[PDB]
Amino acid sequence: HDMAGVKALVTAGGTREPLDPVRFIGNRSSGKQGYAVARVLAQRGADVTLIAGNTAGLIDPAGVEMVHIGSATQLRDAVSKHAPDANVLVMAAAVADFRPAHVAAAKIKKGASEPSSIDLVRNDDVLAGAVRARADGQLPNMRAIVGFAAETGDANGDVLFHARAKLERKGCDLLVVNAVGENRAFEDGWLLSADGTESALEHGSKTLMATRIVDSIAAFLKSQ
Amino acid sequence: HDMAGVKALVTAGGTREPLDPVRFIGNRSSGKQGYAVARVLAQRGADVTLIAGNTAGLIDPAGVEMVHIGSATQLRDAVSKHAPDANVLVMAAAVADFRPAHVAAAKIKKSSIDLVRNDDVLAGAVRARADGQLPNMRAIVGFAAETGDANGDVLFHARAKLERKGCDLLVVNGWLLSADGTESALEHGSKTLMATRIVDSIAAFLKSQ
Ligand SMILES: Nc1ccn([C@@H]2O[C@H](COP(=O)(O)OP(=O)(O)OP(=O)(O)O)[C@@H](O)[C@H]2O)c(=O)n1
Ligand SMILES: Nc1ccn([C@@H]2O[C@H](COP(=O)(O)OP(=O)(O)OP(=O)(O)O)[C@@H](O)[C@H]2O)c(=O)n1
Ligand SMILES: COc1ccc2[nH]c(C(=O)O)cc2c1
Numbered sequence: 001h002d003m004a005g006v007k008a009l010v011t012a013g014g015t016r017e018p019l020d021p022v023r024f025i026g027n028r029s030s031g032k033q034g035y036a037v038a039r040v041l042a043q044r045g046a047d048v049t050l051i052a053g054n055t056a057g058l059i060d061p062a063g064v065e066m067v068h069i070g071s072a073t074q075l076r077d078a079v080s081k082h083a084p085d086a087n088v089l090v091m092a093a094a095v096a097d098f099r100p101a102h103v104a105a106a107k108i109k110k111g112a113s114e115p116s117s118i119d120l121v122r123n124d125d126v127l128a129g130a131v132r133a134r135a136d137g138q139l140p141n142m143r144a145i146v147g148f149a150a151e152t153g154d155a156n157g158d159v160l161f162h163a164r165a166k167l168e169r170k171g172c173d174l175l176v177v178n179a180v181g182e183n184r185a186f187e188d189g190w191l192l193s194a195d196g197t198e199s200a201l202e203h204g205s206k207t208l209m210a211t212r213i214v215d216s217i218a219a220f221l222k223s224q
Numbered sequence: 225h226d227m228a229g230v231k232a233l234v235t236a237g238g239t240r241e242p243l244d245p246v247r248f249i250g251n252r253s254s255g256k257q258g259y260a261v262a263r264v265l266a267q268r269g270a271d272v273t274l275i276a277g278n279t280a281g282l283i284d285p286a287g288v289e290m291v292h293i294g295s296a297t298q299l300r301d302a303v304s305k306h307a308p309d310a311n312v313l314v315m316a317a318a319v320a321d322f323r324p325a326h327v328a329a330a331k332i333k334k335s336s337i338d339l340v341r342n343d344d345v346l347a348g349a350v351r352a353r354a355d356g357q358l359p360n361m362r363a364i365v366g367f368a369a370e371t372g373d374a375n376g377d378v379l380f381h382a383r384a385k386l387e388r389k390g391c392d393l394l395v396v397n398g399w400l401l402s403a404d405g406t407e408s409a410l411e412h413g414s415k416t417l418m419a420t421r422i423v424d425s426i427a428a429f430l431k432s433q
């Protein structure tokens with residue numbers, strides 16, 4: 001029970017930026033990977049609370065207090081509220097970077113006219129505010145902040161050169177890059193610790209992936 | 225088994241228009257209504273093909289030919305390949321009306337997005353039949369999604385949609401509008417009963433033909 005006596009808060013799923021009651025803007029996270037690690041935590045003795053975004057269809061993990069949100073701002077409101085109680089923070093949510101400038105209260109009808117263009121307004125970075133909040137002494141309880149990253153690589157640089165920067169810019173303790181697995185085929189794995197450790201993530205299932213991460217988390221709490 | 229020897233084509237769920245590998249634009253359909261009709265359809269003897277977009281984790285109906293799609297262009301092309309074989313088309317998919325002007329092949333690293341309209345598949349099916357490309361098509365069904373405003377009721381707007389679209393039946397959400405001008409109400413029973421009233425209403429038409 002390596003995680004006995006730990007209150008752990010995790011975010012999972014992808015957020016939806018409404019355009020109107022029906023249309024919206026999204027990121028392609030199923031949420032399964034985030035659910036998978038919270039489930040392991042509960043297994044290792046951890047006190048888990050799950051903020052989940054649009055992951056319905058998935059079954060609620062046993063022993064985990066669940067809270068549901070929809071927009072990316074609804075996430076920030078949810079995270080801010082439960083955060084000063086948690087010992088560990090895990091942000092496996094694919095949070096939307098932007099949202100429509102205005103939301104109509106009703107459906108927008110399809111016209112025979114040059115389809116207009118959607119202007120955008122930036123959403124609050126939840127993980128960056130939490131590093132600041134702790135840094136400002138607002139988190140006496142927080143012992144661990146874990147991020148998740150997706151990188152493909154550009155001609156600026158590969159997938160790996162890109163997330164050493166993101167780890168340095170966001171300032172979290174561990175960063176999981178390219179870490180979602182496959183149970184079906186065609187469905188780079190990299191753990192970046194804050195020590196400069198670049199342990200690679202074995203290609204495998206969501207569970208072994210989820211196990212290695214909590215495995216990587218526990219060690220840190222012991223080093224602390 | 226009133227639907228013996230009937231080839232039937234169904235769409236259900238929603239489409240997703242890529243922005244890049246990760247971001248996309250969609251709708252909020254469950255797919256439940258369409259899956260329910262294909263299910264009821266199969267029960268009465270139909271050769272069912274389900275072109276299915278985004279759902280809530282729904283399970284593929286059985287005895288149903290399934291086709292899975294993501295974008296709306298993937299749907300149009302999916303419907304076109306399978307259309308000349310069917311005797312009935314049921315267009316319960318919530319199809320995206322537009323898609324991004326540009327799609328990135330890789331992730332966009334951290335404004336305004338320009339848009340392009342998607343071809344209206346149901347309208348393309350209604351005229352296609354009128355033009356004699358579908359001797360096999362005997363019934364074409366649309367589904368209306370209305371919230372309403374000050375220009376009219378959810379109800380009025382969709383009297384317009386029946387005339388603009390030109391299909392055999394239009395089911396509004398619970399109400400059902402025939403091409404006779406027939407206007408029926410749907411009791412909010414189970415989606416299973418709604419789907420039952422619907423196929424019953426579809427069947428009635430094929431005899432009136
Ligand atoms: N490009 C599109 C979009 C809609 N659909 C179909 O057209 C019907 C009408 O649905 P609705 O979205 O309410 O009609 P729209 O013409 O898109 O009206 P609106 O202005 O509300 O968007 C649905 O069966 C849907 O499957 C379609 O085939 N072609
Ligand atoms: N508004 C946001 C966006 C992301 N994150 C967190 O920051 C990490 C970065 O995820 P990713 O989307 O891959 O990177 P971005 O922050 O979007 O940066 P970029 O656009 O450069 O890829 C993730 O753990 C995510 O949960 C967050 O909480 N706040
Ligand atoms: C945008 O980056 C992504 C893309 C897909 C994803 N899936 C999951 C998951 O929780 O399974 C997380 C996640 C993040």
Ligand SMILES: [Ca+2]
Nearest residue numbers: 095096097334
């Ligand atoms: Ca992003």
Ligand SMILES: [Ca+2]
Nearest residue numbers: 110319320321
């Ligand atoms: Ca539409």
